């Protein structure tokens, strides 16, 4: 019996009254449009935006902490080298804005040096992420923005083939250029090569080298695209699993352990992978939201009272939209809880509080590599956790409105079925 229900659950009686009233249904649909703008059209006040940003900064931060400690070297085919130094610019090396790959004789691989092939793949993702963070990420609904990215590396030493025609695609080592394209979007890449002799003036390093410049135009800076870059960054590290050893700075924070393999940070890498996975799922709700616009008013037909049993074909879409928004909100929350130091324990808590949520740069803007970036995240991790919480706090009303819109629609789908 139903009077008996609506006695103990009077909240349910109100819900049914609201579901029979086009004017309350339309109000709930307006609210869904406004909370959608907040989630996918805004930046500072979008929980969704803040969690995407957090997932990306945690990946970048992880490399800013450990990159300088990581062995790399060898030649182009993942082969060991006899005497190859390959240096990657705008990377957070030890007291330096470059990372030097100069480990010879050892075969590249697991618990050894990172091959130059993996490092190139890693470095490209890093430079793209850093350029995008620096310019500022766009709102989740902006899917056709692009950024330009430029980066350089150098090869020296007898036998070093990491800047060759085969590694690069460029015909003449001195002055040559090659253009290739790639992928929904066309990304154009221009690669250029130059040779600097050992004696040339303005060559302080005492040796001959080849320089490769890569210029990428039309790089997508959408959230989905950047998360894919962050995933590439962290997965390359985890799969290559190179040896590292840290300079334990004889003063404050202490790295645990000091020698080892990079994938030995299992809790940290898992957490970051899980953040990225959750932010990807979160950003996928965007198209669910766009596909089920809630802006048309609903309300009977033929000047005849609204009938919740027959006239509610729109309910399916309203439910899917409301559910997609709630899911965004919850995933955004899950992202923050994966990395928030308040709920973390031991080794993993030290890593985040002592290194990842720290910056040693003399705030400097996002995406800036200095000679003191190494061993600190320098990716605004603490500020982002804080802004995620601030934005969740300012989403109180909207979350209730979304749950109400979902309940209304769910009632109409039940009645229609």
């Amino acid at each position, epitope marked *: 019996n139903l009077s008996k229900l609506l006695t103990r659950y009077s909240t349910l009686n109100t819900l049914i009254k609201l579901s029979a009233d086009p004017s309350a249904i339309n109000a709930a649909r307006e609210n869904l449009g406004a909370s959608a703008k907040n989630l996918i059209g805004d930046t500072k006040n979008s929980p969704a935006y803040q969690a995407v940003l957090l997932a990306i900064n945690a990946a970048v931060g992880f490399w800013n902490v450990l990159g300088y400690a990581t062995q790399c070297g060898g030649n182009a085919n993942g082969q060991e080298s006899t005497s190859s130094t390959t240096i990657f610019n705008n990377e957070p090396g030890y007291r330096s804005t470059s990372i030097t790959c100069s480990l010879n004789r050892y075969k590249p691989g697991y618990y050894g040096p990172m091959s130059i092939e993996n490092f190139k793949k890693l470095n490209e993702a890093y430079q793209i992420l850093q350029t995008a963070l620096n310019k500022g990420l766009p709102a989740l609904k902006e899917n056709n923005g692009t950024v330009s990215v430029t980066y350089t590396y150098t090869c020296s030493g007898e036998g070093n083939d990491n800047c060759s025609k085969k590694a690069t695609g460029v015909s003449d080592q001195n002055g040559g250029t090659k253009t290739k394209t790639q992928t929904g979007k066309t990304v154009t890449t221009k690669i250029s090569s130059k040779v600097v002799d050992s004696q040339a003036k303005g060559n302080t390093t005492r040796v001959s080298y080849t320089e490769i410049t890569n210029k990428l135009d039309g790089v997508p800076d959408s959230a989905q695209a950047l998360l894919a870059q962050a995933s590439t960054l962290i997965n390359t590290i985890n799969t290559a699993c190179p040896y590292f050893s840290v300079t334990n700075k004889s003063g404050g924070p202490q790295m645990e352990p000091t020698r080892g393999k990079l994938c030995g940070f299992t809790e940290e890498i898992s957490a970051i992978q899980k953040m990225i996975t959750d932010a990807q799922e979160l950003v996928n709700q965007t198209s669910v939201i766009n596909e089920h616009e809630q802006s048309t008013p609903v309300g009977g037909n033929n000047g005849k009272p609204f009938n919740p049993f027959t006239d509610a074909s729109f309910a399916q879409g309203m439910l899917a939209n409301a559910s997609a928004q709630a899911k965004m909100l919850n995933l955004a929350h899950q992202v923050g*809880q994966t990395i928030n130091p308040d709920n973390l324990t031991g080794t993993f808590k030290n890593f985040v509080t002592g290194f990842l949520a720290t910056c040693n740069n003399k705030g400097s803007p996002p995406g800036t590599v200095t000679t003191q970036t190494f061993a600190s995240g320098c990716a605004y991790v603490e500020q982002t956790i804080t802004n995620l919480n601030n934005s969740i706090a300012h989403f109180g009303t909207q979350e209730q409105q979304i749950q109400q819109a979902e309940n209304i629609a769910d009632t109409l789908v039940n009645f229609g079925s």
Partner: nanobody
Amino acid sequence: VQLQESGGGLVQPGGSLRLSCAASGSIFSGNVMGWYRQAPGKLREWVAAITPQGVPNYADSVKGRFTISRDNAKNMLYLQMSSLKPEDTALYYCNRLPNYRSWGQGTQVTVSS
């Protein structure tokens, strides 16, 4: 698992009440927390919230009269209510934001002359 509000009662307009919520560590620790209320004939309405670092914010209907606070050592959430009006009559509830799917029992506040 656990949200448990207390402190409600019948009061006079102009009056004060202090509500409490004892929350489990799971729910409370490192989470935004807040207060909600459900008045006769209406659905649940958000009322106030506070970040882990203690920044409060309020719905317009209670701003300047209610104060939300948190005690991080004891997993406690509080809502000090002043200048109460009949319109504040409701079942008051606390939860994290975003909400844990199971609500506590609430605490009744009635404001009446």
